[PDB]
């Protein structure tokens, strides 16, 4: 009796447009079943009206099954360029972004996966997602707990944020840093850790996102994975940690991170060595706690070995030397550190670094390290024997000449640094003879006239030490040092005033 | 006592990639993840 049992697209498109929702729901199911077959797919993808109806129904329906079926249909069409284009041109992105707010998982999954496909292969998709407010929706979803979903969501964020300062700011405003750090500290799924580390790397170069990542516990979270078997993950964490380092010098609970970084200096991967050295240099800056920990785990030796391996590679020696500089001053184990640099055979290479081909940034740091090393009397003779004095004087003379930004460094800083190093080295009777013999007194007296308070201090300091010897005190007086030193008794700097009084007393 | 500590900026080092090189694709790793999630 009932016959005709077993143009389909044009018929279904009409049904999805029906005002009757029960009809729309049933048609939605049929369309979805058809999207499962490649044959029926092309027919759907080629119909502008079909796609538009699917997109409209999805964002307007109140039926969960209809939302699921239409979202699933679009996902099925997203595997082909033609499908991606049709979805794109039919207003699919705003619709999909709206679906990211759905309380049903199946719908969210179809939406985020289809969006990822659009972002990867559809020209114009990134901009559309940003405009539609996708960034904000995605960050909000980072509190979900399905690790596969989180991996796709975070990668979408990476695609959208890469090379786009505005997107990074949006992510920041939506609380992205804290959510991303939470992921790093909570999950173990490598692909997610990796996609998430890529986002953090991108954000870490933003001056606004850097402080937010650090305060969220980012340094500690990234540090937790520096030993994971995934090389790509370790590298991403290291690069990110380095970018953030200059903003994490006030963080606590860095013990674990510092320990691993020191061990990483012993890596055969020069890129890992370079990053770890850079991170260590910044983390040891004005933080006695961090210096203590680094020294306790053999950091001095590791850093000396790093300098030796680096050779003339200044992208490795600068941070390694700066780090050694930080480790040799102002902390309970600074004295031990000053001795360790010597006991680990580092005095010769440190002095060598004062010579060409080293550039000013490295020389500046090296002078600073030698200044620290000189605080340890056992280093007085070794430093002299390696020729440190003559070179320091050479640098001083050159730098002073200029003062009468060079290669990125202010020569005034070199004058202050070399003269300070010489001031400390002059504590040694033998070094005083060498310093005196290089005809340095006239130059030291001239520095008393320096407009820089710190230069007058170290100049008076070295003259004070030199004046301990009669003949020297005589040479200092003959240079007309009396006049300026007397005026310096009125210095606002206690050190200057004190050193000046000491020299005046000795000249008499 | 001693030299003053100083920070090092890695601004250029970090901004290098996003300026000179195009962004990498993670499809190889996520393809299976996406099909599985769906």
Swiss-Prot record, chain A:
The modification Phosphotyrosine is found at residues 187, 189. Residues 12-34 are annotated as: Interaction with BCL9. One of its GO terms (biological process) is embryonic skeletal limb joint morphogenesis. Phosphorylated by NEK2. EGF stimulates tyrosine phosphorylation. Phosphorylation on Ser-47 and Ser-102 by CDK5. Phosphorylation by CDK2 regulates insulin internalization. Ubiquitinated by the SCF(BTRC) E3 ligase complex when phosphorylated by GSK3B, leading to its degradation. Ubiquitinated by a E3 ubiquitin ligase complex containing UBE2D1, SIAH1, CACYBP/SIP, SKP1, APC and TBL1X, leading to its subsequent proteasomal degradation. Ubiquitinated and degraded following interaction with SOX9. Ubiquitinated via 'Lys-11'- and 'Lys-29'-linked ubiquitin chains by UBR5, leading to its stabilization. The modification Phosphoserine is found at residues 47, 102. It comes from the Eukaryota. It is found in: Cytoplasm; Nucleus; Cytoplasm, Cytoskeleton; Cell junction, Adherens junction. GO terms for molecular function: alpha-catenin binding; cadherin binding; chromatin binding; disordered domain specific binding; DNA-binding transcription factor binding; enzyme binding; histone methyltransferase binding; I-SMAD binding. The keyword Acetylation applies. Key downstream component of the canonical Wnt signaling pathway. In the absence of Wnt, forms a complex with AXIN1, AXIN2, APC, CSNK1A1 and GSK3B that promotes phosphorylation on N-terminal Ser and Thr residues and ubiquitination of CTNNB1 via BTRC and its subsequent degradation by the proteasome. In the presence of Wnt ligand, CTNNB1 is not ubiquitinated and accumulates in the nucleus, where it acts as a coactivator for transcription factors of the TCF/LEF family, leading to activate Wnt responsive genes. Also acts as a coactivator for other transcription factors, such as NR5A2. It is linked to Colorectal cancer: A complex disease characterized by malignant lesions arising from the inner wall of the large intestine (the colon) and the rectum. Genetic alterations are often associated with progression from premalignant lesion (adenoma) to invasive adenocarcinoma. Risk factors for cancer of the colon and rectum include colon polyps, long-standing ulcerative colitis, and genetic family history. This is Catenin beta-1. It comes from Homo sapiens (Human). The chain holds residues 135 to 663 of 781 of the full protein.
From Swiss-Prot, chain B:
Residues 1-38 are annotated as: CTNNB1-binding. Signal peptide: none annotated. It comes from the Eukaryota. Changing residue 13 to A: Reduces CTNNB1 binding, and abolishes CTNNB1 binding. Changing residue 15 to A: Abolishes CTNNB1 binding. There is a cross-link at residue 11 (Glycyl lysine isopeptide (Lys-Gly) (interchain with G-Cter in SUMO2)). It is found in: Nucleus, PML body; Nucleus. Detected in epithelium from small intestine, with the highest expression at the top of the crypts and a gradient of expression from crypt to villus. Detected in colon epithelium and colon cancer, and in epithelium from mammary gland and carcinomas derived therefrom. In vitro, phosphorylated by TNIK. Phosphorylation by NLK at these sites inhibits DNA-binding by TCF7L2/TCF4, thereby preventing transcriptional activation of target genes of the canonical Wnt/beta-catenin signaling pathway. Residues 8-32 have a biased composition (Basic and acidic residues). Changing residue 18 to A: Reduces CTNNB1 binding, and abolishes CTNNB1 binding. Participates in the Wnt signaling pathway and modulates MYC expression by binding to its promoter in a sequence-specific manner. Acts as a repressor in the absence of CTNNB1, and as activator in its presence. Activates transcription from promoters with several copies of the Tcf motif 5'-CCTTTGATC-3' in the presence of CTNNB1. TLE1, TLE2, TLE3 and TLE4 repress transactivation mediated by TCF7L2/TCF4 and CTNNB1. Expression of dominant-negative mutants results in cell-cycle arrest in G1. Necessary for the maintenance of the epithelial stem-cell compartment of the small intestine. It is linked to Constitutive activation and subsequent transactivation of target genes may lead to the maintenance of stem-cell characteristics (cycling and longevity) in cells that should normally undergo terminal differentiation and constitute the primary transforming event in colorectal cancer (CRC). Type 2 diabetes mellitus: A multifactorial disorder of glucose homeostasis caused by a lack of sensitivity to insulin. Affected individuals usually have an obese body habitus and manifestations of a metabolic syndrome characterized by diabetes, insulin resistance, hypertension and hypertriglyceridemia. The disease results in long-term complications that affect the eyes, kidneys, nerves, and blood vessels. The promoter-specific activation domain interacts with the transcriptional coactivator EP300. Belongs to the TCF/LEF family. This is Transcription factor 7-like 2. It comes from Homo sapiens (Human). The chain holds residues 12 to 49 of 619 of the full protein.
